Amino acid sequence: HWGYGKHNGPEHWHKDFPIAKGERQSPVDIDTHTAKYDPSLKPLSVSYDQATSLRILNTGYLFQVEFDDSQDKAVLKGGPLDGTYRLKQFHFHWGSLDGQGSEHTVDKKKYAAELHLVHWNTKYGDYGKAVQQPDGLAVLGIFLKVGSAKPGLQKVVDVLDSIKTKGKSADFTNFDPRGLLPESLDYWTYPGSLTTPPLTECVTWIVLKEPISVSSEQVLKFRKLNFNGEGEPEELMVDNWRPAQPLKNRQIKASFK
Numbered sequence: 101h102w103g104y105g106k107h108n109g110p111e112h113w114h115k116d117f118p119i120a121k122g123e124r125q126s127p128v129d130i131d132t133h134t135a136k137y138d139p140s141l142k143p144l145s146v147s148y149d150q151a152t153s154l155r156i157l158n159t160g161y162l163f164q165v166e167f168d169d170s171q172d173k174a175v176l177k178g179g180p181l182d183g184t185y186r187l188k189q190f191h192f193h194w195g196s197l198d199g200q201g202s203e204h205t206v207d208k209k210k211y212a213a214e215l216h217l218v219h220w221n222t223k224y225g226d227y228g229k230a231v232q233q234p235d236g237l238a239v240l241g242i243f244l245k246v247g248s249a250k251p252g253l254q255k256v257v258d259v260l261d262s263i264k265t266k267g268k269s270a271d272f273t274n275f276d277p278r279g280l281l282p283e284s285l286d287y288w289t290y291p292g293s294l295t296t297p298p299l300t301e302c303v304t305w306i307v308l309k310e311p312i313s314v315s316s317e318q319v320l321k322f323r324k325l326n327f328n329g330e331g332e333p334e335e336l337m338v339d340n341w342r343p344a345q346p347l348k349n350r351q352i353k354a355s356f357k
């Protein structure tokens with residue numbers, strides 16, 4: 101199966117998922133000097149006041165926190181989006197070293213990790229339909245740098261030892277994703293794709309300019325997870341990021357400056 105290694109990593113994915121070589125692949129390098137300020141973009145509206153987390157899961161590729169998306173609770177709207185997108189899950193990608201781990205880059209700068217909050221377009225009724233459509237998903241991306249601890253991340257960090265291996269889950273209720281946001285909602289936006297197979301071109305990317313700070317100890321705990329399942333040989337879950345893909349004809353828009 102696909103993964104992040106020499107044998108089955110990003111450079112191999114095209115053989116099972118030919119859209120890997122498509123015209124709107126993600127992530128990309130964000131060249132801050134060619135991005136266009138767009139005074140017509142709206143401020144993002146991130147409404148997470150009624151978010152209901154359910155569960156945290158080690159998928160064998162990453163870990164994800166899942167939300168009850170059976171009602172209009174936690175929604176993203178505004179900015180470049182038409183309509184209303186419902187929060188389904190967040191997850192992270194991270195490095196073996198603090199020097200790498202993010203999927204998007206900024207003027208070629210790699211961050212230690214990248215948080216993705218995945219939302220689906222409620223015009224399509226549910227996630228499984230939405231992920232098939234060109235404007236099905238909106239993913240909010242937030243860079244992590246290593247520095248001061250992020251207090252709102254600690255509840256996540258502390259549960260990871262209960263989901264060390266592929267397929268493990270744990271109840272994860274009452275987690276507030278507002279704790280993971282930076283102060284500023286200034287963003288870049290561009291049309292792209294899932295960054296993991298099946299690499300579908302269904303994503304409007306919204307990448308915040310301001311990183312959040314996490315401690316060395318918090319990211320260290322991400323790196324103790326395992327790609328493998330229980331009772332299989334230990335492979336640390338590190339470097340689960342796809343490198344930047346060709347921008348092709350696309351324009352990155354900035355909400356600011």
Ligand SMILES: CCCSc1c(F)c(F)c(S(N)(=O)=O)c(F)c1F
Pocket residue numbers: 101102103107108109112113114115116117
């Ligand atoms: C023997 C186990 C690895 S075989 C393999 C593979 F090499 C891939 F590149 C892929 S891919 N194109 O999905 O990365 C794959 F699914 C595989 F099963």
Ligand SMILES: CCCSc1c(F)c(F)c(S(N)(=O)=O)c(F)c1F
Pocket residue numbers: 216218237239293294295296297298303
């Ligand atoms: C694979 C599709 C099922 S889960 C998923 C996803 F929805 C994403 F948007 C992304 S991402 N990285 O494009 O936000 C992701 F990595 C995922 F694993």
Ligand SMILES: [Zn+2]
Pocket residue numbers: 191192193216295
């Ligand atoms: Zn992701």
